[PDB]
Amino acid sequence: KPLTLLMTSSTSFSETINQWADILKTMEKFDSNPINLLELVKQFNLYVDELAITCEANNVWASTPNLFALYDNSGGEAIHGHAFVPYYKESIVLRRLFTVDPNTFNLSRFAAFEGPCQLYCAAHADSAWVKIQTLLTLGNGIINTLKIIKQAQAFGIDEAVTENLKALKEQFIAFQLAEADIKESLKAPSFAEPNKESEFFYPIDEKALAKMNGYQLATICLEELNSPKPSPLIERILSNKKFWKRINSAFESGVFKGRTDDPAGKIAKIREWHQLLQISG
């Protein structure tokens, strides 16, 4: 009397939940083993990306340091591969914070924002950011609960395949309530509104940029290589001779080694690009 949870009367996370909520809303019988969590991760990640786009388009975040700028206690140090840069766009921090890795089903670390964000949450409970965290966190959760359930069952732990499964479902409900709150907020009107320099950061003036240290600057350069085509922001950073000593120094510190986005390849490229730009400034 098998009941593995059914994949496609939905191809988008929000709906695909409720084809699932639906039939966990509708009992005794369950092979979670056949379930595609990995597909679920693929959908959720789109959900996150699409929710981020939307937020940045509706101006929902309202120099222009970002929201989390005043809560940085990092001392410009690199926290697990990332340094704090007050010019990250909120929607990128969003992405970095809630997108699930398909290879581990866990998060890639975006540590320098982990604390400032929490602080920001504690000081603006009504904020949009919170309502979004609440939502996407439940998305991470649902994902997790499924992971657990699969292996618990796979291991025995009848206690485990059971007490969660009550919860997995229970999360579905709070999600919805979340989708509902978030939704109304994004329905709000907004005036029209782009930065040519970067996909990831707000505009950074000459003054602002020079005040960055090697970890901060390296972090920016690594972030820019996430774009398919060389960016004006990185050409500005790499073409400036005064910046290099501290950028390369940070590379050598070994601090970026653990990153998941091929820091070795990125760094090798950055060094090549700098070599090129060093000629003819």
Binding site: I79, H80, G81, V100, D101, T104, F105, N106, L107, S108, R109, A111, E114, Q118, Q133, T137, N140, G141, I143, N144, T145, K147, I148, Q151, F155, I157, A167, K257, G258, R259, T260
Partner: protein, 177 residues
């Protein structure tokens, strides 16, 4: 087959080395990859203490407040809970007080505790004095220990002694009313 089945839980601030600790205990491996745990995970390893064969069911939790609702639900059913801090992170040590609070709140009345400072291999950056820490632990009738997950230093011991303190409590509970 086993004589005992103990359920353990690791808790502490984000990035202090919980997952790295559990992996070292279960798989004897260590990865440097910057991965962060979502919600909870669990590994299983069987040890034998005092000729008795003990099954360890160990759950890693996520340190971020945004996951608390999910992790907390795993306390009450635990025999022992290892609280972990980073000997290079003063705030994570200061948070131990709050972490112990979360135990009083979700965990069973007579659950076994254990304080751990990780990353002891980082001699240069160490900022929490062992001595200062053994005090606090003592002040509470709790065992203490400094581990490096990177090197295997005191890792197998930490779990071993949490296991030992449970068999001890398990035994007193069968004995007296």
């Amino acid at each position: 087959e086993y004589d005992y089945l103990f359920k353990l839980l690791l808790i502490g601030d984000s990035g202090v080395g919980k997952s790295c600790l559990l992996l070292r205990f279960a798989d004897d491996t260590y990865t440097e990859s910057y991965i962060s745990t979502i919600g909870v995970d669990f590994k299983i390893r069987t040890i034998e203490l005092d000729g008795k064969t003990i099954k360890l069911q160990i759950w890693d939790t996520a340190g971020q407040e945004r996951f608390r609702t999910i992790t907390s639900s795993y306390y009450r059913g635990a025999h022992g809970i290892i609280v972990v801090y980073d000997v290079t992170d003063q705030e994570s040590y200061a948070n131990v007080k709050q972490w112990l609070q979360e135990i009083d709140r979700y965990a069973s009345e007579n659950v076994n505790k254990l304080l751990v400072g990780n990353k002891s291999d980082l001699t240069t950056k160490k900022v929490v004095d062992n001595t200062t820490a053994k005090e606090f632990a003592d002040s509470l009738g709790i065992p203490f220990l400094e581990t490096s997950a990177k090197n295997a230093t005191n890792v197998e011991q930490a779990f071993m002694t949490m296991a030992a303190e449970i068999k001890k409590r398990m035994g007193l509970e069968v004995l007296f009313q």
